[PDB]
């Protein structure tokens, strides 16, 4: 929960972010986490939850 703050601050994940409101979809979030590679699959599922 510190690395997630860092990642949301990061611009690479904001590239996956597309909605003008700034809210991202579940699939886009999953893809952005996978691209960053900081989190493994189970972790990604947890932060999605």
């Amino acid at each position: 929960f510190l690395k997630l703050k860092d990642i949301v601050g990061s611009e690479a994940f904001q590239d996956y972010v597309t909605d003008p409101r700034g809210l991202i979809s579940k699939k886009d979030f999953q893809k952005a986490m996978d691209s960053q590679k900081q989190f493994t699959g189970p972790e990604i599922q947890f932060l999605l939850s």
């Binding site: 990061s10 690479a12 590239d15 691209s35 960053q36 590679k37």
Partner: protein, 48 residues
Amino acid sequence: QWDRLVLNTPSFPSNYWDKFVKRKVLDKHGDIFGRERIAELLGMDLAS
């Protein structure tokens, strides 16, 4: 600012002997900032 000109040139490491500089940079910073972005910055083509 001037060095920005040489990043994507094919022969950037002409005098310095380390010929794997671009590959090392790509492997080091590809994940966080994007392999495609790094390759575009350094003028290298992974498909090629």
